[PDB]
Design an enzyme around this catalytic site. Sequence first.
Site, PDB file in Angstrom:
ATOM      1  N   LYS A 286       0.827  -1.203   0.000  1.00  0.00           N
ATOM      2  CA  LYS A 286       0.000   0.000   0.000  1.00  0.00           C
ATOM      3  C   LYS A 286       0.863   1.255   0.000  1.00  0.00           C
ATOM      4  O   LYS A 286       0.619   2.191  -0.770  1.00  0.00           O
ATOM      5  CB  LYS A 286      -0.939  -0.014   1.207  1.00  0.00           C
ATOM      6  CG  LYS A 286      -1.826  -1.246   1.272  1.00  0.00           C
ATOM      7  CD  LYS A 286      -3.133  -0.973   1.997  1.00  0.00           C
ATOM      8  CE  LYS A 286      -4.142  -2.074   1.720  1.00  0.00           C
ATOM      9  NZ  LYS A 286      -3.615  -3.410   2.112  1.00  0.00           N
TER      10      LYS A 286
ATOM     11  N   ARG B 241     -12.121  19.017  22.941  1.00  0.00           N
ATOM     12  CA  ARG B 241     -11.128  18.946  23.999  1.00  0.00           C
ATOM     13  C   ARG B 241     -11.165  20.235  24.808  1.00  0.00           C
ATOM     14  O   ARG B 241     -11.573  21.291  24.314  1.00  0.00           O
ATOM     15  CB  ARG B 241      -9.727  18.714  23.431  1.00  0.00           C
ATOM     16  CG  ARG B 241      -9.585  17.415  22.640  1.00  0.00           C
ATOM     17  CD  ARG B 241      -8.134  17.133  22.248  1.00  0.00           C
ATOM     18  NE  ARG B 241      -7.280  16.828  23.395  1.00  0.00           N
ATOM     19  CZ  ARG B 241      -7.102  15.609  23.902  1.00  0.00           C
ATOM     20  NH1 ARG B 241      -7.728  14.562  23.379  1.00  0.00           N
ATOM     21  NH2 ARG B 241      -6.299  15.437  24.943  1.00  0.00           N
TER      22      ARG B 241
ATOM     23  N   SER C 203      -4.396  12.454  29.825  1.00  0.00           N
ATOM     24  CA  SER C 203      -3.522  13.363  29.092  1.00  0.00           C
ATOM     25  C   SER C 203      -3.121  14.554  29.949  1.00  0.00           C
ATOM     26  O   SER C 203      -2.060  15.148  29.728  1.00  0.00           O
ATOM     27  CB  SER C 203      -4.211  13.841  27.813  1.00  0.00           C
ATOM     28  OG  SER C 203      -5.377  14.592  28.110  1.00  0.00           O
ATOM     29  N   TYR C 204      -3.951  14.915  30.929  1.00  0.00           N
ATOM     30  CA  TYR C 204      -3.604  16.006  31.831  1.00  0.00           C
ATOM     31  C   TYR C 204      -2.272  15.737  32.521  1.00  0.00           C
ATOM     32  O   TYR C 204      -1.375  16.588  32.523  1.00  0.00           O
ATOM     33  CB  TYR C 204      -4.715  16.201  32.862  1.00  0.00           C
ATOM     34  CG  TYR C 204      -4.442  17.313  33.845  1.00  0.00           C
ATOM     35  CD1 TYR C 204      -4.719  18.635  33.520  1.00  0.00           C
ATOM     36  CD2 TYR C 204      -3.905  17.045  35.096  1.00  0.00           C
ATOM     37  CE1 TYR C 204      -4.471  19.658  34.415  1.00  0.00           C
ATOM     38  CE2 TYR C 204      -3.655  18.060  35.998  1.00  0.00           C
ATOM     39  CZ  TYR C 204      -3.939  19.367  35.651  1.00  0.00           C
ATOM     40  OH  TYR C 204      -3.691  20.385  36.542  1.00  0.00           O
TER      41      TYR C 204
ATOM     42  N   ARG D 189      -0.028  13.639  31.562  1.00  0.00           N
ATOM     43  CA  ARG D 189       1.006  13.574  30.535  1.00  0.00           C
ATOM     44  C   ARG D 189       1.431  14.959  30.046  1.00  0.00           C
ATOM     45  O   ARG D 189       2.293  15.050  29.162  1.00  0.00           O
ATOM     46  CB  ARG D 189       0.523  12.719  29.358  1.00  0.00           C
ATOM     47  CG  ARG D 189       0.150  11.284  29.749  1.00  0.00           C
ATOM     48  CD  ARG D 189       0.253  10.310  28.578  1.00  0.00           C
ATOM     49  NE  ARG D 189      -0.548  10.720  27.426  1.00  0.00           N
ATOM     50  CZ  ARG D 189      -1.860  10.532  27.310  1.00  0.00           C
ATOM     51  NH1 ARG D 189      -2.544   9.935  28.278  1.00  0.00           N
ATOM     52  NH2 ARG D 189      -2.494  10.945  26.220  1.00  0.00           N
TER      53      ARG D 189
ATOM     54  N   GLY E 227      -9.266  15.576  26.496  1.00  0.00           N
ATOM     55  CA  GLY E 227     -10.586  15.130  26.085  1.00  0.00           C
ATOM     56  C   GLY E 227     -11.526  14.842  27.232  1.00  0.00           C
ATOM     57  O   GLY E 227     -12.743  14.820  27.034  1.00  0.00           O
ATOM     58  N   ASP E 228     -10.985  14.617  28.425  1.00  0.00           N
ATOM     59  CA  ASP E 228     -11.781  14.383  29.622  1.00  0.00           C
ATOM     60  C   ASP E 228     -10.870  14.593  30.824  1.00  0.00           C
ATOM     61  O   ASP E 228      -9.704  14.972  30.681  1.00  0.00           O
ATOM     62  CB  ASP E 228     -12.396  12.980  29.611  1.00  0.00           C
ATOM     63  CG  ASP E 228     -11.367  11.894  29.365  1.00  0.00           C
ATOM     64  OD1 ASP E 228     -10.368  11.834  30.113  1.00  0.00           O
ATOM     65  OD2 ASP E 228     -11.555  11.102  28.420  1.00  0.00           O
TER      66      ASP E 228
ATOM     67  N   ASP F 243      -9.683  12.454  34.285  1.00  0.00           N
ATOM     68  CA  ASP F 243      -9.644  11.155  34.950  1.00  0.00           C
ATOM     69  C   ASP F 243      -9.074  11.368  36.348  1.00  0.00           C
ATOM     70  O   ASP F 243      -7.866  11.573  36.506  1.00  0.00           O
ATOM     71  CB  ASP F 243      -8.799  10.162  34.152  1.00  0.00           C
ATOM     72  CG  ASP F 243      -9.235  10.059  32.702  1.00  0.00           C
ATOM     73  OD1 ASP F 243     -10.393   9.659  32.458  1.00  0.00           O
ATOM     74  OD2 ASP F 243      -8.421  10.377  31.809  1.00  0.00           O
TER      75      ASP F 243
HETATM   76 MN   LIG Z   1      -8.782  10.511  29.905  1.00  0.00          MN
HETATM   77 MN   LIG Z   2     -11.651   9.158  31.051  1.00  0.00          MN
END
Ligand SMILES: [Mn+2]
Ligand SMILES: [Mn+2]
Length: 318
Positions: free
Chosen positions: A61, A135, A166-167, A169, A175-176, A178
């Site tokens: 490909k 986000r 991700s916060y 990180r 996106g949310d 946790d």
């Molecule tokens: Mn999350």
């Molecule tokens: Mn989450």
Amino acid sequence: HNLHITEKLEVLAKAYSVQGDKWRALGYAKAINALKSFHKPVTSYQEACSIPGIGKRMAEKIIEILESGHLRKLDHISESVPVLELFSNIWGAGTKTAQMWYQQGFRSLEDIRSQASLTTQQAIGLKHYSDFLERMPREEATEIEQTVQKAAQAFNSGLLCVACGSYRRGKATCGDVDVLITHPDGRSHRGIFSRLLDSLRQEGFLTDDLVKGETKYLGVCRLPGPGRRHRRLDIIVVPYSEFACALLYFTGSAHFNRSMRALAKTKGMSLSEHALSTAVVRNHGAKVGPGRVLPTPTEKDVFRLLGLPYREPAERDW
DNA sequence: CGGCAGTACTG
DNA sequence: CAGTACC
DNA sequence: GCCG
Ligand SMILES: [Mn+2]
Ligand SMILES: [Mn+2]
Ligand SMILES: [Mn+2]
Ligand code: NA
Ligand code: NA
Ligand code: NA
């Protein structure tokens, strides 16, 4: 570096994902990331075969996009794929629900709203369809974590609350949120939810509940004032002994956890959100041994016991 | 041939 | 149970 | 889809 290659492959990956072929979608996903991280522009079939995650089929490909500048299979993606993606972007509706709706004649969210039987979760996801695709600035993630912490620490100041995802990180947008909660005494963590959730719903902070478990809560919150959007919020409570492993799992990324699990397997161990376990017995399928939970008071211990150098959260954004 | 992870919810 | 979601 |  190879965005002319990956952009075409992402279409296929998405098409496979929404159509239910999760393993093919996985293969494309891994190859797509291997492409970005690579040092230079791909230029040869044997070069393509050079990289881990790209095999014969996808070397072909990549070989095709090289010469002609486009992919032959892209012109034969079923016309249903955009609708399936539209439907599966409803929280609580996956590939199976999306394909059933499509079979039953639904083609738009207006169709879904007016004629579809939806679960309680899906009605909430639909109501927040646009908000949940946005986000948030990481400074908003901070306000949300501190909102939860203030409510939890009001009951017991000993409670530890940490936003992961991700916060943790270090990403500029999330996106949310946790939020992970525990207690050093190893017992103060249980039964916290009933009082904590009712407190957060006392504020109007919590607007919808998606999952109300004994150890995990998933829902929707919104900070006060104008110009605020509804945000996805997860709250996980763990015993202090599992804090390190939970911290590691919920910080991610998902690809990073995936890589950590495979490494653990090469060493006869397993790694979950709860524990790092050793002397696991596999036939490559777990068979004749769960094993023993190895002690892991810190994230550093997990890396150490796996024979890896420690990576702080920001270098786990794979 | 077959793993590519497990764990918790919902109904 | 199948389906969905969490990283 | 890749890879052992
Ligand atoms: Mn999350
Ligand atoms: Mn989450
Ligand atoms: Mn909103
Ligand atoms: Na390869
Ligand atoms: Na969905
Ligand atoms: Na109709």
